[model samples]
Target: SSIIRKVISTSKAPAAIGAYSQAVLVDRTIYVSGQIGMDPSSGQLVPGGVAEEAKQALKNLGEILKAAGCDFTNVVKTTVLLADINDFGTVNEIYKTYFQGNLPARAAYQVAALPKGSRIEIEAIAVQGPFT
Candidate 1:
């Protein structure tokens, strides 16, 4: 048989608007795609600026992680994208709320723009098993 993999999907998170999956699971690792501020129900970017967008984006990421059978604690790395670098501090404040103290290697950058003109987007990589 050929190698097999899983495509993680959940109604708790926004649907992929393009040609991509919310996440993918291979072996013990899961790679979650970028999540914008778009609401899962409305399919639109959430209002109230960067902080709000960051929160929703992280929530979307969380839902995808959950669908993959893990959570933020399983995340070993993340990449945050911002439409404007000035929003960095505000996004960070909201980000830490989900991440807490220390975990997940992270990188943040101000991208030229994002899909649906969202102010922020987040993606993560997580591992779900503890091998002996």
Candidate 2:
């Protein structure tokens, strides 16, 4: 089995503000870096609130997934970080809209903070498989 490490990226998602690839594909698995709500073009969050940020965060994550030759359905696990625990319900509400298949195993936490003061952030792992 070839174990070549490959970096996955796209202009659809916000560029990494620091040193990191949006995602990496090795073998058939992809490890997506944590994503925030910053718009790729604007370099700023969507402006509404936690709800909008959460939605955009997942959207950015989705963009990275597809760019890596996969999509939401293939995600096997995820970790969500929030600045305010109060936003959990709202974040979950938006999170559910992104996945179309069996929900991936997940964990959510209240972080003291997130990069760029992002209200929410998401990092995901996915496996490539036959598309339905």
Candidate 3:
């Protein structure tokens, strides 16, 4: 048999508003695209600070995972990009709230900038079950 795949989109999360799908699922694995702090419905950046942006970004990631028939528990890795490395402490504080227990491997980098002038962006990878 051949593997079937699908793409995920949701209004709960920010729309791509670009030439990209929010997430792509192939077999049991899902690749989620980088998510900024923009609210899909409002198409406006969330209020507050890096904490809010990080929270919204994670929410976007969660929505994508749900669309792929999975959840944060299924995530194996994540990548976070920050416009300023100085915000790492603040962002990490919020990030720990989401992935404290079953925290997946993650890599974080400081980037020159992000769309909408967002302070942070996050992307994730998830699997339906333990790999063989």
Among these predictions, the greatest TM-score belongs to: 2
Where's the lowest-lDDT run of ten residues in candidate 2?
92-101
lDDT of each prediction vs. the true structure?
0.87, 0.88, 0.85
* lDDT by residue (tens digit), candidate 1, 13-93: 988888999999987789889889888998898999888888888999898888888888888899989899998888888
Q: In model 1, what is the error at residue 39, expressed in angstroms?
A: 0.6
Q: Who is ahead in TM-score, 1 or 2?
A: 2
Give per-residue lDDT, candidate 2, residue 39: 89
TM-score of each: 0.92, 0.93, 0.91
User: By lDDT, who's the top model here?
Assistant: 2
The candidate, 1 or 3, that scores higher on lDDT is: 1
How many residue pairs in model 1 have overlapping backbones? Answer: 0
What CA RMSD would you report for each candidate? 1.7, 1.6, 1.7
lDDT of 2 by residue, 1-132 (tens): 658688998999888889999999998899999888888888788898788888888889888988988889999999999999988888888888888669999999999999888899898999988856
**Stretches of candidate 1 above 4 Å error?**
1-4
| Total colliding residue pairs, candidate 3 | 0
Error of 3 at 85 (Å): 0.7
Candidate 2 stretches greater than 4 Å from native: none
Candidate 3's residue-wise lDDT over 24-85, tens digit each? 88888888888888776886789987888888888878877877777788888989999989
For model 1, the run of ten residues with the poorest summed lDDT: 123-132
